[PDB]
Design a protein around this ligand. Sequence first.
Ligand SMILES: *C[C@@](*)(O)[C@H](CCCCN)NS(=O)(=O)c1ccc(C)cc1
Ligand SMILES: *C[C@@](*)(O)[C@H](CCCCN)NS(=O)(=O)c1ccc(C)cc1
Ligand SMILES: [Cl-]
Lengths: 264, 264
Amino acid sequence: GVSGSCNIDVVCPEGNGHRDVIRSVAAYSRQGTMWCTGSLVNNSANDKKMYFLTANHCGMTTAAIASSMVVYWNYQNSTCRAPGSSSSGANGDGSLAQSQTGAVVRATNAASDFTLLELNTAANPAYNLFWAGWDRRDQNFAGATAIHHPNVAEKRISHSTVATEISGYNGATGTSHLHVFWQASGGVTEPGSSGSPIYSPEKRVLGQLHGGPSSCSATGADRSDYYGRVFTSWTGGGTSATRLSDWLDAAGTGAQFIDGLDST
Amino acid sequence: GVSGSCNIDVVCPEGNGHRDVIRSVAAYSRQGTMWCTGSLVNNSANDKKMYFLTANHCGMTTAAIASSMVVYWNYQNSTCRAPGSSSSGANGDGSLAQSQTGAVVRATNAASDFTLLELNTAANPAYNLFWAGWDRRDQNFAGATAIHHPNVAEKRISHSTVATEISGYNGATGTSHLHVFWQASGGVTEPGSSGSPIYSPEKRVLGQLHGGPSSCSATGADRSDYYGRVFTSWTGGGTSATRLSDWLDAAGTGAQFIDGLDST
Ligand SMILES: *C[C@@](*)(O)[C@H](CCCCN)NS(=O)(=O)c1ccc(C)cc1
Ligand SMILES: *C[C@@](*)(O)[C@H](CCCCN)NS(=O)(=O)c1ccc(C)cc1
Ligand SMILES: [Cl-]
């Protein structure tokens, strides 16, 4: 696929601290068309359920639509294309051969733009998946990392090395979103990156991409994005079909954050 | 309510050409909290069905939520507060006494951020409603007018006197949205304005507000917004529950555009 050249292929050295959670992230199609990003999340039972977090605006919100989604694992460029180069802006060499079809919708809610699916097919050990941890505490972090499929193309990584902020979407009054500021010449996110995770420094999901002003040409405060918060989605719309808590902590352990789980 | 001072109270002379479609627009609450804008739309049978167009991201997509929504008609400042003045930025004197409760969802679709509700209660003649026309043709216009409740506060009007453009949301590749550019010191839209109509110069709904960079301090290309298009929503997700056509032209007249219908 094709995305902005300033983005950073996950196989680049910039991915060296994220070789586990890289394997959580997937691209998917909707009604056959490459559409959005999501990622696999662990739950407090550490049971490998195929919980797959994405964005509500991607429209994976009915049983009918979820039934025919196709999830593509391990779609990334085989080599590190220099960020900012014509190569990085070119069609990559990723494979779309490792896939699975079908899901059900466990919860969805507009306010924090989240959808939690559960994929129908158990993880194929051969795909070498990872279920990422999460952190639902009400706080900002000193930096964060995005792993995403911009334009639903090969997987990329984008780092933030400044504090997050809490606000409503697009800077409005509110607390539903984490505002993440990209590096002046670093990776960003693009349409199709929606639903991709943002990870704390401890590699725990804090939210999933809603949208924002960033692009490779964006400067200043425009080089940033908003993530619907796990903190907010945890309680969501106050019902099991509109929140994360029933799914990610079904046994009521009281966990405020958990670590990931490998397929190994 | 309180909204940005650059906005223009509908009773101002700027509303002199829109005294009909002003009466289409309402503010509404969601689980009791003032939340978003929507508006009444005519259909090809001219029958006063309470079709009420709003934005999908406002989250009025389930029977439970739609059943408890409250719609507030004729909420506007009684006098024209000078745009840009401290008065315009102050709490207004609108009334929230003319209301009705409850709706059902007729159609919704994420890609053009639309929801078509049908309100449960037939129009009270005393509220003096108007059902606006619509135009589903695939084209730009030379200007456009927004009527909306920014911050879900008193009703405002914003005029665009330059051409619209067609794009995806936030300027992405696509054709799902109408991009409307506000006047350098004119009215804009704000969170809470979502779901409000944009009208052609002929006063026909062309779409409903999704979002965008505008605010009273925005300049240039940022002083603009994106509306999910009626053109796009007409066919929507390809089923009656995901598109406008079955509802706004149930009669199968083949109309490409219709005019409005007054309570009289
Ligand atoms: C849906 C997502 O892929 C995008 C991500 C944009 C990231 C830009 N830096 N979100 S969005 O805001 O463009 C969007 C929101 C709603 C709809 C219906 C489409 C696109
Ligand atoms: C929901 C709407 O009230 C706003 C309108 C913003 C207008 C700015 N000029 N849309 S939004 O983009 O701020 C938005 C989109 C999705 C969600 C969940 C919240 C807000
Ligand atoms: Cl949105």
